[PDB]
Amino acid sequence: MTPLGPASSLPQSFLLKCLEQVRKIQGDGAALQEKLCATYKLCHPEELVLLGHSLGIPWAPLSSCPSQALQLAGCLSQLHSGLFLYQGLLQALEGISPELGPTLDTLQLDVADFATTIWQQMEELGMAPALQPTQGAMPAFASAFQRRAGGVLVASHLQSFLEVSYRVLRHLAQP
């Protein structure tokens, strides 16, 4: 009929294993994204971020919710629009042509599973997007010099937001 399924902080160790998987895959994408970033453009300190911010347009900050306690739908709007901007930009770099390594597909694959879980949260309540362009158009820098620089710059900002996301992910067991 129904095996014994007690309810006492049982679901947790599995979440720890998944976290470890995201840690190893994030580290591999970090060293591979930095080595590929310099071997491709240069990946120097602050310098091109200016032309990347004007041509790339300002994007979401480092974190989503301030103190993680203010409107759940709002946090889902910034996390869905932010993750949608990172997935669209990643789709642009992969859409360019110079593959230079199939690894970008497996890293984007992990980001695909993430966007999927956010689309599940959307299933519960995710019909309030915060982006109203002309009518379908965004994932495509146009492919060129400023566009390639926009791609590598978004890559660095992607690893930064990824580290801060892992941080807040570990800090989610207060209760």
SS3 sequence, the chain? CCCCCCCCCCCCHHHHHHHHHHHHHHHHHHHHHHHHHHHHCCCCCCCCHHHHHHHHCCCCCCCCCCCCCCCHHHHHHHHHHHHHHHHHHHHHHHHHCCCCCCHHHHHHHHHHHHHHHHHHHHHHHCCCCCCCCCCCCCCCCCCCHHHHHHHHHHHHHHHHHHHHHHHHHHCCCCC
Q: Which experimental approach was used here?
A: NMR
The Cα-based distances of 2 to 5, 6, 12, 69, 156 in angstroms read: 8, 11, 22, 37, 49
Each domain of the chain, given as residue ranges in start order, spans: 1-175
Architecture per CATH, 1-175: Up-down Bundle (1.20)
